[PDB]
Amino acid sequence: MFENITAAPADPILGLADLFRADERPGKINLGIGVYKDETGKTPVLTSVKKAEQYLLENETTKNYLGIDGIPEFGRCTQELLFGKGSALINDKRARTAQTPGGTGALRVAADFLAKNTSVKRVWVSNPSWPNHKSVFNSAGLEVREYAYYDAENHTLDFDALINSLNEAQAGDVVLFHGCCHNPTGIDPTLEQWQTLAQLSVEKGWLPLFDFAYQGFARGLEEDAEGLRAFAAMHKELIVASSYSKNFGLYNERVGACTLVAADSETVDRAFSQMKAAIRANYSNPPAHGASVVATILSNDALRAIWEQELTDMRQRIQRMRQLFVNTLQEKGANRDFSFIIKQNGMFSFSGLTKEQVLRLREEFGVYAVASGRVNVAGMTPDNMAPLCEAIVAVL
Amino acid sequence: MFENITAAPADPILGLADLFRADERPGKINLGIGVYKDETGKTPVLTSVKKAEQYLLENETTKNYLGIDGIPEFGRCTQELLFGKGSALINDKRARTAQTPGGTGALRVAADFLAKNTSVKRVWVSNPSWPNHKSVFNSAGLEVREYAYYDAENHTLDFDALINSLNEAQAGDVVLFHGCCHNPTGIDPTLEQWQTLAQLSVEKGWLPLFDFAYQGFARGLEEDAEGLRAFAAMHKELIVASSYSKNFGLYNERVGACTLVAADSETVDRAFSQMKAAIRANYSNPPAHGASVVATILSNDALRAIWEQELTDMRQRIQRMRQLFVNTLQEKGANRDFSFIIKQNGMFSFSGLTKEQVLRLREEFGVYAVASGRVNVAGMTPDNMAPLCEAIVAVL
Ligand SMILES: *Cc1c(COP(=O)(O)O)cnc(C)c1O
Ligand SMILES: *Cc1c(COP(=O)(O)O)cnc(C)c1O
């Protein structure tokens, strides 16, 4: 039965973590996966997290199954993070959140849900976009077309091209947006551009799906949600797949949520009962640990002040590696001008490095960037900044 | 978009948990859902687990993404649980194991893998069988037919009726078997009967798919897998969705594994690469906490000895409750003979109660059992044994 199965191509992102491993070059540099590293090159467990964990070890008395939808406080606390405190969607009881294994898991459950309870045929994901969007949507059976986004010549948001390409979008289609910190570009629409986009999906009839995976990493917890919010204000229906992987440094615990907002309480309640049926058909119920942690941290005023501090240190440290990179790049000989990198938000900059330049960096210099030229700035430290900028310049 | 979504029926097992967590009657008895309960009426966190957990808190330095397939030693410790330390599938590098969100997460990825990389079109699940088998397979795209199993008259395995029913399955079809502790009948094949099904399966070209969710609740760790080991010796290929939910009391942490065996390593390698592709499109990578706990325990001689003692305590308390149940039943003057209940194994008993007795039993006596007459003998306590046998005896 398995004899003619062909081998699957390694993940463009997750595949790098593999090569880097089997690579023995002593001074190798990993700028691939979107995991935060500190000044010393480690991905530390946040303090607020270790504290929450102590608390759980002491106070947990059962492992008993959570419910299809997970921990209630988790959902409740994530909607205030998403929508705001004393928000219309929350008072009206328009929304329902299921806890899922990471934001990928949210994406998929949203996919299987739509494919199965709606007349949804296709989803629009930006160009470029996180490579895995394509794969989860096709797995549920949805077609994914693409809308223009990045202007590679001026390294900006091509608003027109975005708008004009979206016109081929039918009423009833899903249009996927990135809450903030566009992966891979890091170029986000402004608030006015968000509102403009909020008003069009309402007139054109699309159902927005937000991939919120970097809340906190651009400007601030609240600021980062303006776009999603400008939208929730005008939309009757919405889907939000958010992740706690990056902002809680909780990567392998798998914490995310799929938030379903409808016109009203009874509808959303009804819509949501099918989502739970899909989750039951998939992984049954979610992993308790990471979600309990996030819940513990968000529901305790002290733990939460600490966490907010830690997140703010991650954000800011990344903003220092951005400005250090262009400098060292211009200090070291850079032919081109990489200053547009400073205008990008999040762990990533789209370098504008050619697939042969990235292949060379990896091969000749052990420097690992992704084939598109997306480099993880948070993977850069003041001790590897010099060897990095010399590898890149010797390949331009 | 959501206005037309029909509300979904509650899960026949998981929804029960809610109807229960909702009637404010005082002496209400939940006998529906497979969580273990001790003499005091709760599902405590096992002590080997609290210990492994402390170790993790002290010892973890990072929450960085695991690999799509999870933790190596986890996979490696699972295979020896399944096949046997020594075992040819291990030394010939014939199996590959992926860490998954529970046995339900295993079953689903095997379904998604089978449906997209093979020509499998239908799968055979016994009658009766875990109600969720059908929803999982159907979600992947597969059709599920049924093979005879339970003889409701004599409360046994209707061997020839199962064998005659399976003779309608074609070469290239998936036939799902339960490793031990048939859910919900508790009737399991004999080793002789396992061989016969092993040989016949090999002759009819079926692909065996084992759901092993109770290793250790029947006779013991090693002896519960005999049936499974009987097929592995004769087959080139087979898959195993195994759970650690019940036997490690890690129910909400979601720990299980999908084990893929092929004729040889080059093949299983190639096969597995697509199984990793199906996972990446689903949840991305597995939750670390509980598989790190299981790994720690199986790796450590002290922790493993303690955990094994805990398992044999649960198993034995259950075998105590099943003898106490048919006796007190026999003492409160139950019209019927319920002696077969002793004959079955694992957490459950197929009571033989009609849909209406079990509905009466709950509205009227707060005794919660699954509509099929399935009762969790492990939710029985010497305190609640008297009131429950009087509820049962009064509806028959
Ligand atoms: C990281 C990320 C995801 C995946 O989050 P996980 O929780 O790791 O599964 C999805 N979308 C975007 C835009 C991301 O950055
Ligand atoms: C419990 C069970 C499963 C599920 O294992 P989980 O880890 O809880 O998903 C699968 N099959 C059977 C027969 C079970 O009893």
Coordinates of C-alpha atoms in Angstrom, one line a residue, chain A residues 1-8 11 13-14 18 33 35 42-45 49-50 53-54 56-58 60-66 68 101 104-105 108 112-114 117-120 130 132 135-136 139 172 205 207 237-239 245-246 249-254 260-262 267 270-271 273-274 277-278 280-289, chain B residues 1-8 11 13-14 21 33 35 42-45 50 53-54 56-58 60-66 68 101 104-105 108 112-114 116-120 130 132 135-136 139 172 207 237-239 245-246 249-254 260-262 267 270-271 273-274 276-278 280-289:
Chain A
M1 CA 0.0 0.0 0.0
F2 CA 2.9 2.3 0.7
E3 CA 5.3 1.3 -2.1
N4 CA 4.5 4.0 -4.5
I5 CA 4.1 6.9 -2.1
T6 CA 6.5 9.6 -3.1
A7 CA 8.6 11.5 -0.6
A8 CA 7.4 14.9 0.5
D11 CA 9.0 22.5 4.7
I13 CA 10.6 26.9 7.1
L14 CA 10.5 23.8 9.3
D18 CA 16.7 20.2 10.2
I33 CA 12.3 29.9 11.9
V35 CA 11.4 32.0 17.2
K42 CA 18.8 31.2 23.5
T43 CA 15.1 30.9 23.5
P44 CA 14.4 31.2 27.2
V45 CA 11.2 30.3 29.0
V49 CA 5.7 31.4 32.5
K50 CA 8.0 29.5 34.9
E53 CA 4.1 26.7 35.9
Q54 CA 5.1 26.5 39.6
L56 CA 0.1 24.8 38.4
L57 CA 2.3 22.1 39.7
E58 CA 1.2 23.1 43.2
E60 CA -3.5 21.2 39.9
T61 CA -5.2 18.2 41.3
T62 CA -6.6 16.6 38.1
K63 CA -5.7 16.1 34.5
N64 CA -9.4 15.3 33.6
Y65 CA -10.4 16.2 30.0
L66 CA -10.9 19.8 29.2
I68 CA -14.0 20.5 23.2
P101 CA -3.2 23.5 19.4
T104 CA -2.0 26.6 13.0
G105 CA -4.6 24.5 14.7
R108 CA -7.2 24.4 10.3
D112 CA -12.6 22.5 8.2
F113 CA -15.4 24.4 9.8
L114 CA -16.1 26.7 6.7
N117 CA -20.9 24.3 7.1
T118 CA -20.7 27.1 4.5
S119 CA -20.9 27.5 0.8
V120 CA -17.2 28.7 0.9
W130 CA 3.3 32.5 5.4
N132 CA 1.7 27.1 5.4
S135 CA -1.2 24.0 2.8
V136 CA -3.9 24.1 5.6
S139 CA -6.2 20.3 3.2
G172 CA -18.9 35.0 0.0
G205 CA -19.4 40.8 1.1
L207 CA -15.9 37.1 5.4
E237 CA -19.3 37.8 10.9
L238 CA -15.6 37.2 11.6
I239 CA -13.0 34.5 12.3
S245 CA 3.5 30.9 20.6
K246 CA 5.5 33.9 20.0
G249 CA 7.4 32.3 24.3
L250 CA 5.2 29.2 24.4
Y251 CA 6.1 27.6 21.0
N252 CA 6.0 23.8 21.8
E253 CA 3.0 23.8 24.1
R254 CA 0.6 24.7 21.4
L260 CA -16.0 32.9 15.9
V261 CA -18.0 36.1 15.9
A262 CA -21.5 36.2 14.4
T267 CA -26.4 32.3 15.6
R270 CA -25.2 27.6 16.6
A271 CA -22.3 28.2 14.3
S273 CA -21.6 23.9 17.8
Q274 CA -20.3 22.7 14.4
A277 CA -17.9 18.9 16.1
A278 CA -15.0 19.4 13.7
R280 CA -14.0 16.6 18.1
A281 CA -13.3 14.9 14.7
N282 CA -9.7 16.2 14.7
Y283 CA -7.9 16.2 18.0
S284 CA -10.9 15.8 20.4
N285 CA -10.1 18.5 23.0
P286 CA -7.0 20.8 23.5
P287 CA -3.7 20.5 25.5
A288 CA -4.2 21.9 29.0
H289 CA -0.7 23.1 30.0
Chain B
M1 CA -22.8 33.4 6.0
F2 CA -23.5 31.6 9.3
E3 CA -27.3 32.2 9.3
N4 CA -28.1 28.8 7.7
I5 CA -25.7 26.7 9.8
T6 CA -27.6 24.0 11.5
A7 CA -26.9 23.3 15.1
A8 CA -24.9 20.0 15.6
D11 CA -21.4 14.3 21.3
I13 CA -20.1 10.9 25.3
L14 CA -18.7 14.4 25.7
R21 CA -22.4 19.3 35.0
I33 CA -16.9 9.0 29.9
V35 CA -11.8 8.9 33.0
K42 CA -11.8 11.6 41.6
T43 CA -9.2 11.5 38.8
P44 CA -6.1 12.6 40.6
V45 CA -2.9 13.5 38.9
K50 CA 3.7 15.1 39.5
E53 CA 6.5 17.3 36.2
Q54 CA 8.7 18.8 38.9
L56 CA 10.5 19.5 34.0
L57 CA 10.0 22.7 35.8
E58 CA 13.4 22.6 37.3
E60 CA 13.5 23.0 31.1
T61 CA 15.3 25.9 29.6
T62 CA 13.2 26.4 26.5
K63 CA 9.9 26.2 24.9
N64 CA 11.3 26.1 21.3
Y65 CA 9.2 24.2 18.7
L66 CA 9.5 20.5 18.7
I68 CA 6.7 17.8 13.4
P101 CA -2.4 15.3 20.3
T104 CA -7.8 10.9 18.5
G105 CA -5.1 13.1 17.0
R108 CA -7.0 11.6 12.4
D112 CA -5.5 12.2 6.5
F113 CA -2.4 10.5 5.4
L114 CA -4.1 7.4 4.0
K116 CA -4.2 11.6 0.4
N117 CA -1.2 9.2 -0.3
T118 CA -3.0 5.9 -0.8
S119 CA -6.0 4.5 -2.7
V120 CA -7.8 3.6 0.5
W130 CA -16.1 4.0 19.9
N132 CA -15.9 8.9 17.3
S135 CA -16.7 10.9 12.7
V136 CA -12.8 10.9 12.4
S139 CA -13.7 13.8 8.1
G172 CA -6.6 -2.6 0.0
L207 CA -4.2 -2.8 5.9
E237 CA 2.6 -2.6 6.8
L238 CA 0.3 -1.5 9.6
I239 CA -0.5 1.6 11.5
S245 CA -4.7 9.4 28.2
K246 CA -6.0 6.8 30.4
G249 CA -3.9 9.8 33.5
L250 CA -2.8 12.6 31.1
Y251 CA -6.3 13.0 29.6
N252 CA -6.0 16.8 29.0
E253 CA -2.5 17.1 28.1
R254 CA -3.1 15.2 24.8
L260 CA 3.7 3.7 10.8
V261 CA 5.2 0.4 9.8
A262 CA 6.4 -0.5 6.3
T267 CA 9.8 2.9 2.3
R270 CA 9.3 8.0 2.3
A271 CA 5.8 7.2 3.7
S273 CA 7.5 12.1 5.1
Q274 CA 3.9 12.6 3.9
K276 CA 4.6 14.7 8.5
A277 CA 3.1 16.7 5.8
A278 CA -0.4 16.0 6.9
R280 CA 2.1 20.3 9.4
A281 CA -1.2 21.2 7.6
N282 CA -3.2 20.4 10.8
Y283 CA -1.6 21.4 14.0
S284 CA 2.1 22.0 12.9
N285 CA 4.0 20.3 15.8
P286 CA 2.8 18.5 19.0
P287 CA 2.2 19.9 22.5
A288 CA 5.4 19.2 24.6
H289 CA 4.3 18.9 28.3

